[PDB]
Amino acid sequence: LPDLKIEKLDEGVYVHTSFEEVNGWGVVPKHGLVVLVNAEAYLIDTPFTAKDTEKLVTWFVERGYKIKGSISSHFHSESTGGIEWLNSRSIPTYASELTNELLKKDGKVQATNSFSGVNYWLVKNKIEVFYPGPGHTPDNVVVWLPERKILFGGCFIKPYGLGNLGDANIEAWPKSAKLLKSKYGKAKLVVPSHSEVGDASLLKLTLEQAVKGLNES
Ligand SMILES: [Zn+2]
Ligand SMILES: [Zn+2]
Incomplete structure (x- = not known):
């Protein structure tokens, strides 16, 4: 299996x-x-593995x-696989109230x-967490890095x-992708979870894909 990559x-x-x-693929x-x-470093999402979290x-x-x-975007392992370990290491692990439930x-x-709430600052003016509303998961959030507009x-x-x-x-993804596409359009870069890093356009395509996604069923 592919090695951890830190770029x-x-x-x-x-x-x-x-x-x-x-x-999947x-x-x-x-x-x-x-x-x-x-x-200081902040893990935005944690590898699905303790190992990689450790690495x-x-x-x-x-x-x-x-x-x-x-800080985890959602409850899936993609973003929480290491909270366990991080916790044994006494690493302050952060997740929305909804993800934890x-x-x-x-x-x-x-x-x-x-x-909880629509937004939570993990760091005063640097690590802003955000609930665009339900979408990929009911609790899914997105972390904005104001300083770098990422x-x-x-x-x-x-x-x-x-x-x-x-x-x-x-049914709620669109509304969410729009509340999102509306709050972070000033974005210089958008960091998907499985795609190359794109620009503020990803916020629109996600919307499109969401409504599109809804149109079907
Ligand atoms: Zn997921
Ligand atoms: Zn995923």
């Missing part, structure tokens, strides 16, 4: 890329991010970066730090298909 994306923001054979590259406030973690730890915490609903270890749509931003409809609010 600087922009200033103080890396794109860790884990791979889990969720039998076989092996899938789950793109996450490690926002480096300054001397990603120490990769940054090893380079003098204290890991203040992780979902993690707890799935008997998965829940992130120790919750938060958004981590994660699995919400699905520009070429809606992907896993399993836990998706096909």
Whole structure:
């Protein structure tokens, strides 16, 4: 199985890329991010594996970066596989109230730090979390990196298909993609969860794909 990939994306923001054979297109590259406030690192989404979380973690730890915490876009393992480990390591793990009710609903270890509402600042003016509303998952959120004008749509931003409809609010995705396409259009880059990093246009295509997605069924 493909090795973890940590590629600087922009200033103080890396794109860790884990791979889990969720039998979709076989092996899938789950793109996450490690926002480096300054001397501190934040795992935006955690690899589906503790191992990779450990690797990603120490990769940054090893380079003098204290890991203040992780933040998950949604409850799936793509974004929570490491909360467990991160928790054993006493890493402040962050997930929405809705994701945790979902993690707890799935008997998965829940992130120790919750938060709710349309928006939550994980870091005053640097790591903004956001509930565009239901979409890929009922709890799915997106993390905006104001400073770099980078958004981590994660699995919400699905520009070429809606992907896993399993836990998706096909009826609410559009509304969400629009509330999203409306709040973060100032975006310089949008970070999907399985596609190359695109620009503010991904917010529109996700919308299109969502309505499109809805039109069918
Ligand atoms: Zn997902
Ligand atoms: Zn996904």
